[PDB]
Design a protein around this ligand. Sequence first.
Ligand SMILES: O=C(O)CCn1c(-c2ccccc2)c(-c2ccccc2)c2cc(C3CC3)ccc21
Length: 135
Amino acid sequence: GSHMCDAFVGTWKLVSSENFDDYMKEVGVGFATRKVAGMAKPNMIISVNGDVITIKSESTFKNTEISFILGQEFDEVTADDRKVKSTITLDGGVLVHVQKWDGKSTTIKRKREDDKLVVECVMKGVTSTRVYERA
Ligand SMILES: O=C(O)CCn1c(-c2ccccc2)c(-c2ccccc2)c2cc(C3CC3)ccc21
């Protein structure tokens, strides 16, 4: 039956992006990829099937897909083509996604707030806020 994270399940569309270009600079994304990725307005599709959660992006830039079990580390290739080790957990209602590569790590936290899904992307001291609403 249902689970708390069923509040993330559905189809979402990006409506607000703040400081993403500075986040991508901290991550190390090069110029052309920053400009083309920063223009994108991806939809995000989140589904659950038993213990397996799947998060997809769909856009004019890249379509990405990850499927995972909470707390169980996996391999991920990101939209900017980094090969990372990822682990996703739930901390009180917040989906916390840690990506590690080449000695660096970034954390992407997804939480519901009103009718929005608010995504905070953190790399060292730079934070980007990406707000989605239901599509
Ligand atoms: O919601 C966010 O934006 C954070 C997670 N994330 C996504 C994404 C992932 C799943 C669903 C919807 C968007 C993209 C993304 C996917 C497709 C097209 C454009 C961007 C993304 C790109 C980056 C650049 C690597 C630095 C960092 C985090 C990223």
